[model samples]
Target chain A: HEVVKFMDVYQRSYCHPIETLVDIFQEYPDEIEYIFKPSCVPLMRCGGCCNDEGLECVPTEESNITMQIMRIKPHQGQHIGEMSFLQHNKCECRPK
Target chain B: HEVVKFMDVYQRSYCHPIETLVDIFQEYPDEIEYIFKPSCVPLMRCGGCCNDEGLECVPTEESNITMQIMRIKPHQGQHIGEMSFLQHNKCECRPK
Candidate 1:
C-alpha cells in the first residue's frame, strides 16, 4: 500500500493530476489490486477523456481479478480525455 | 487574500480540483488579488488545453492590471485540459 500525491500551482496547458495515479497503477498493474474500477483509454491518441470508473482494466497478471482504473470521458461535463497499457498519454483535449 | 481549497479522493469521469480554485476566482474574479496565474481557456468550447501561466485574465475591475490564474496544458506531460471568464466550466476534456 503506497500513496503519493502533491499539489502545486502548476503552470501548463493541461494537468492530468490523476495521470500520476495511473502511473502509479502502471508501477503495480499486475500487483494485488482488487475492487478496481473498470475504465481506461489508451495512453496514446487519448485527449484526457479516459473513463475513471475506478475499475476499467483486467490485466492478465496473476491475481488479476478484472482490475485497473477506469473512467467514462465526458461522463459529466463537456470536453476531456487518458493513459494506457499503451498508445496515448494523459494529454487533455483542446477545441480547435 | 482569501484562500479556499479542499482535497478529496474524487470519483468522477474527471476531477478539476483546481477548478474550485477558479470557482473561487469566479466568485471574486475582480477582487483585489495579486500573484495570480495567467492561464484561462474559456469554459465554452475548450477541451482543457488552456495554458496555465498562473497569471491570466485581467479584471478591469479596478486595481486590475493583468491578474488571474493561468496554465499551459501539456507543459510537461502529454495529457491534460481548464476554465475561463465565461463560456464553459472546469468540466475538463475527454477524447472522442
Candidate 2:
C-alpha cells in the first residue's frame, strides 16, 4: 500500500514566497530587474509598489546607473503549470 | 529548443493491444480472469469474442474444473484512471 501525505503549512511556506516573487517579477520586471542585474543597486527604495509607479521611474540620484536597461515581459499562462500540481494532488488520494 | 515527434504507427502498435486488453479486462473481469488464473484454460476458443459467448460457457469437458468457481467483479469507474493517462498525454507536448 502506497501512501503519501502533504503538509499544508510547510508546502505553502516553501512554495508561496517563490510563487509571489514569480508573480511580481512576471508582472513587473522593469522595476525588479535591478535587484538581479550585475550592478549592485536597489530600485525599490522609495517604498512603493513596483507594478504601478516604480515601473515608470527615471534614472535617479541614488548611484551612477551605467547598466543597459532591459525589459522583461510576463509569460502567458505562466501559472497554469503550477496550478496543475495543486490540482493533481487534490484529485488523487495520496499526498494532499 | 525541445522538440518531440510522435511516430503514429509504432506508438499505436505499442500501445493499442495493451490498451485494448486493459479496456476489455476492466470492462469484463469475469471473462478475462479465467485466462489468467492457475487453471491453464483457454476460454476464447474459435475467436468468438470473449465478451459474448465465451463469458457464458460452462465447464463441460474441461479437465478438473475444481477452480472454486470464483466470480470476478469489475470495479466501478475502472477505466477512469486509464483514461487519465491518455488525457495527460494529449494535453502536453511530449513523447506521445
Candidate 3:
C-alpha cells in the first residue's frame, strides 16, 4: 500500500529478506551414477537499517535450511551433498 | 562537495559518529565534602547501513574513552567516577 511505502522510508528499524541467486559448491567425494551439474540456487537474505543512535539491525530468529550442492573435480569426479545453513526469519535493531 | 552529497544518497555502506547528549550516573559512595551534580555529556555514536544483502556495516576499529560521571543522594551524599567505553573509528560491510 501507499502507507507502507511511506513507512518504509521513515522506518527506524526493519528486517526482511530479498531473493537472490547464490552459488553452492562442494568437493566431490566420489562420482555417482546420477548426472550432476553446478548451478545457482535461489535464497533469501535478511538485512535492514537501524536508527542513527548507534544501533544495528540484526537477526533475532533464524532457521537452518538444507541445500543440495554439486561439485566436480578431476580427481574427485562429481559429488553431491546437502549443506545446511541458517536463514534469518526475524530481525530487530539493538545496541552494538 | 556536491559529489559527496550524491554519494551519501547512494552509498550502500558507511559508518560515522554523530554528536549526542548522554546521561551518566553512578551511586554515591558517601562522599565527605565534594559537591557533585548530575549532568548530560556530549558523545559520539557509530552507525551506518550496509548493502541490501546479508551484510552489515560494523565497526572495524574502535577506541575507549573515559567519561566523568557524578551522582548524588540524600543519605549517600555525592560521588564522582570515571567510566570508559568504546567508540567506533572505522567501519566496513561484512557478512552476517
Per-model TM-score on C-alpha atoms = 0.19, 0.14, 0.35
Candidate 2 lDDT tens digits, B1-96: 121112221122121111011122333355653221111111211111111212321222222111111232335222111111110111111221
lDDT head-to-head 1 vs 3, winner: 3
**Worst lDDT window (10 residues) for model 2 chain A?**
A80-89
Models sorted by lDDT, best on top: 3, 1, 2
Best candidate, TM-score: 3
Name the best candidate (by lDDT). 3
Could you report the DockQ of all the candidates, in the order they appear?
0.04, 0.02, 0.02
In model 2, where do residues sit more than 4 Å from their true spots?
A1-91, A94-96, B6-15, B19-96
Per-residue CA lDDT of model 3 for A1-96, tens digit only, reads 212122322231133453323333322224344333323343454544443346665777777665554444546586665545456677776888
lDDT by residue for model 1 (A1-96), tens: 121111222332232322222332344475443222322211223222212223222212121111223332333432211222432333443332
Off by over 4 Å in 3: A1-5, A8-13, A20-40, B1-96
Question: Ten consecutive residues with minimal summed lDDT in candidate 2 chain B?
Answer: B80-89
True contacts kept of 2: 0.00
Candidate 1: regions farther than 4 A off: A1-8, A12-14, A17-89, B1-21, B31-96
lDDT of each: 0.27, 0.19, 0.44
Give the TM-score between model 1's chain B and the true chain B: 0.17
* Model 2 per-residue lDDT tens digits across residues A1-96: 121112221122121111010122333355552222111111222111111211321213232112221222235221111110010111111121
Q: How good is the docking of model 1, as DockQ?
A: 0.04
